[PDB]
């Protein structure tokens, strides 16, 4: 097993969340299934994938993180902030020799950039 | 952004789920926080991480997948089966030139191995 590849993310609004993940996070189009209301988006070419799945009821917070380089922590924080996203951190994770940034998607999920 | 690094997984029983993720999936010990009832486990050295978080109420199914090599699909299916885990697939994902195996963790989450 080589790492984490994909996560399914429950979203309140497929279009608004697709806009966030593609325009703000820069993920690339994959497969938009307007029938099931799912959108499969690619992370870093073919390195990862998020599957946005529309669900209008029963909200529950999710947490997941994306890998970034330590040297890119401040640029990424600034880029998110410029696009209107509030960013917490950097937070040092001494026990794992890591640095994290924390921010929300449009659904209030707890997203993170982690540098190792 | 280089890929997906970590997912938080809600579990009914921290010990039973920790046993599954370490003994069956082979993830390595990281940080066991018996206070918050969380266990941070490493995937493929430092390539990824799962954070098991005990929650005894409000079950909701999660979906996530781990990256594997295409040539390892049958060995991994067999290995899981040998450890008592029922495996579905391989399923060809033609649109993304991928192959998937599907199986459950002890919480009934929808886990997957994806080969690209």
């Amino acid at each position: 097993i080589k790492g984490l590849f994909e996560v399914a993310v429950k979203v309140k609004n497929l279009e608004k969340s697709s806009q966030f993940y593609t325009e703000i996070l820069g993920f690339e189009a994959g497969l938009l299934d307007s029938a099931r209301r799912w959108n499969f988006l690619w992370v870093s070419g073919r390195a990862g994938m998020v599957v946005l799945q529309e669900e209008k009821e029963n909200w529950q917070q999710q947490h997941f993180s994306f890998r970034v380089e330590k040297s890119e922590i401040e640029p990424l924080k600034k880029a998110l902030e410029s696009k209107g996203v509030s960013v917490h951190g950097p937070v040092n994770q001494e026990w794992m020799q890591a640095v994290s940034l924390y921010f929300a998607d449009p659904n209030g999920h707890a997203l993170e950039f982690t540098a190792l």
Side-chain angles (χ1 to χ4, degrees), chain A:
Chain A
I1 298 170
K2 301 304 182 179
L4 186 59
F5 177 69
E6 135 200 346
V7 293
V9 183
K10 304 300 184 175
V11 306
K12 288 288 184 168
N13 184 305
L14 191 62
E15 287 74 26
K16 293 187 178 170
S17 282
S18 295
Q19 292 171 354
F20 178 93
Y21 284 84
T22 61
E23 299 177 10
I24 295 191
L25 300 185
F27 300 165
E28 289 179 286
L31 170 62
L32 178 59
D33 186 349
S34 291
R36 290 195 295 177
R37 301 294 287 165
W38 292 12
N39 197 2
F40 299 75
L41 299 174
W42 291 99
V43 182
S44 200
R46 286 172 66 84
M49 173 167 281
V50 294
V51 188
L52 308 180
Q53 300 175 145
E54 193 175 76
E55 280 217 333
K56 303 193 169 181
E57 311 207 329
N58 305 336
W59 187 87
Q60 271 202 16
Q61 198 175 232
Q62 293 179 238
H63 170 69
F64 46 94
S65 86
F66 304 95
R67 183 67 173 274
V68 307
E69 293 164 341
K70 285 189 170 172
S71 63
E72 297 298 334
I73 289 288
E74 300 288 343
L76 284 165
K77 173 174 178 184
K78 193 71 174 180
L80 287 174
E81 287 171 335
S82 75
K83 290 173 182 180
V85 178
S86 295
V87 181
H88 177 78
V91 174
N92 285 334
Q93 312 285 7
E94 293 177 350
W95 65 268
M96 52 179 291
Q97 298 87 31
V99 180
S100 299
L101 295 171
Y102 295 98
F103 61 98
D105 83 347
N107 310 107
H109 293 314
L111 276 59
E112 173 187 348
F113 293 152
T114 313
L116 294 88

